[PDB]
Design a protein around this ligand. Structure first.
Ligand SMILES: Cn1cnc(Cn2c(=O)c3c(=O)n(C)c(-c4cc(C#N)ccc4Cl)cc3n(Cc3cc(F)c(F)c(F)c3)c2=O)n1
Ligand SMILES: Cn1cnc(Cn2c(=O)c3c(=O)n(C)c(-c4cc(C#N)ccc4Cl)cc3n(Cc3cc(F)c(F)c(F)c3)c2=O)n1
Lengths: 304, 299
């Protein structure tokens, strides 16, 4: 049929050119170097004696510039200023990053997707795509030493940084901040076991992925039941799916036009899947309903 | 575990576009040579069965438009090597990474940088299927996009995309222009043969499950390699080679589970099914993570 379907990340080169390593004493993690400032998680100034409940502002006033070792590949960068914005440490260095891309800091909404460049000791190791969960965690793939890896989207030639990785929660999901240092979700940069709120499924993204499945020739789940938007949302909420808004229906328009399947008709298919299950069948090779592709992700991949 | 691509920056810096007339596709610029599919020299009249030798004889350096963005790179020599065109240019790419060309085996995974008009659009992980296709994601204009692995600072290029087959899977060559599989670069009826399951990767996935403490399927037996291979083929699984056994060695050592004991465990799963149980939260056995991917991603 059409031309295949995969989780796809943005090319990571523009972000790779910004990754550095930041060390405080025995403590090492990753930083992001843009112009003459390096941004990283402030937890780097804590020690194991501090980590349970750090007083960051005490820790920082006791710091000197020379306490921070910033390395870009093989070159050591001189720190000539330091400050802290929320949970992000900013180190001013005496040289600009020549590879600084055009960029913006943005705070993303639950449901939106982004790419993550996982790094260790300042070196990029892998790229993958994630979503901000409705409970403001992310289901990433990160190991010890990934602290400071960033998430982003690319538009034309501009990198929108939206995430900086801080921690792994006990359930194995991940928590972090925007680039102003504000956590997504109710989390705190202390080494304490932290639970997230109950998660829900991102309905508009499931619908977008069902439209991808149709574009790829997988149509077994379609039906002719009718639904209104309100009645679809009542069933959705019953199954811990997020509400679908009229803005969602509008954003699904291009996918609906391309496949000739009305958005509310696709909702009636999803309603049936939620009530009856998949009967051990798959959709796009998946046994589960996938909710980490946005409408934009689908269109870009299947039309653009 | 999840599927990760390699950081794509080293390959991004090698992508260019190649145009002949009104036809444009992607090329790879390493040192002073640009590599691209030779299909670029065909017209819509040539496509069913092109005479590539003839079409190339009629080409001169001045007929090829190579661009890095809007910047044209002057072509100073051309040749064809199997199904790849090689265009020598007058500028060595200053972003050339350390690199090798390698030809991979079925089962091996790699990252694809999908590009359109020389501009990278996205990166994803893929496996070479046993039928020598990939289940990629590509649109028209993606011809010449490449697949690669990175080891330390070195980029091992293993795939250059040529075409989509009627089932929507993809076919291409190595960087010496030799197709994976029986495919040819012309618009004919060619079809992917029936595919099979990549046994060595399933085994690596079971090892990953064990490492993470998910070990219910470890049965009390062992098997010979021959008996396992004969049973595997009955379930449309690939037979294991001696090289597969060897690449499983680091996971076998890490878990203390002999390769042939894990084979016996998989044999029971094939013969009996899951009983409704899951492995790593999946009712399905995954066959697109290699033993390297498990090592790479658990560490
Ligand atoms: C398994 N895994 C998956 N993702 C991760 C990411 N990941 C790391 O990369 C990492 C690291 O590299 N490092 C280095 C430290 C660290 C340890 C000490 C000590 N003793 C002091 C400072 C730090 Cl930053 C903590 C880290 N932590 C714990 C942590 C991180 C925080 F920013 C935080 F505010 C908090 F309260 C706790 C972490 O979660 N791990
Ligand atoms: C939906 N989709 C998914 N993957 C793709 C990749 N994809 C392209 O990107 C693409 C392209 O960009 N282009 C430009 C051409 C093209 C057309 C003409 C004409 N007329 C002449 C030369 C070429 Cl290279 C053919 C292409 N083809 C067809 C093709 C490509 C071959 F190299 C080949 F040997 C063959 F016999 C047939 C293709 O498959 N498309």
């Amino acid at each position: 049929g059409s031309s295949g379907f995969r989780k796809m990340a943005f090319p990571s080169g523009k972000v790779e050119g910004c990754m550095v390593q930041v060390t405080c004493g025995t403590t090492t993690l990753n930083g992001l170097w843009l112009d003459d400032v390096v941004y990283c998680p402030r937890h780097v100034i804590c020690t194991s004696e501090d980590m349970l409940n750090p007083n960051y502002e005490d820790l920082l006033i006791r710091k000197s510039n020379h306490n921070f070792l910033v390395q870009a590949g093989n070159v050591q960068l001189r720190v000539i200023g330091h400050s802290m914005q929320n949970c992000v440490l900013k180190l001013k260095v005496d040289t600009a990053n020549p590879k600084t891309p055009k960029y913006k800091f943005v705070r993303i909404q639950p449901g939106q997707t982004f790419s993550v460049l996982a790094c260790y000791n300042g070196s990029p190791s892998g790229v993958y795509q994630c979503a901000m969960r409705p409970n403001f965690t992310i289901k990433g793939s990160f190991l010890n030493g990934s602290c400071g890896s960033v998430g982003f989207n690319i538009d034309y030639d501009c990198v929108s940084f939206c995430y900086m990785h801080h921690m792994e929660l006990p359930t194995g999901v991940h928590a972090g901040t925007d680039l102003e240092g504000n956590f997504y979700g109710p989390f705190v940069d202390r080494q304490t076991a932290q639970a997230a709120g109950t998660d829900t499924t991102i309905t508009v993204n499931v619908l977008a992925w069902l439209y991808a499945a149709v574009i790829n020739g997988d149509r077994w789940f379609l039906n002719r039941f009718t639904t209104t938007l309100n009645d679809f949302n009542l069933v959705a909420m019953k199954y811990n799916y997020e509400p679908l808004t009229q803005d969602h229906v509008d954003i699904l328009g291009p996918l609906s036009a391309q496949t000739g399947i009305a958005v509310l008709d696709m909702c009636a298919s999803l309603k049936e899947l939620l009530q009856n299950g998949m009967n051990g069948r798959t959709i796009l090779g998946s046994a589960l309903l996938e909710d980490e592709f946005t409408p934009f992700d689908v269109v870009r991949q299947c039309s653009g």
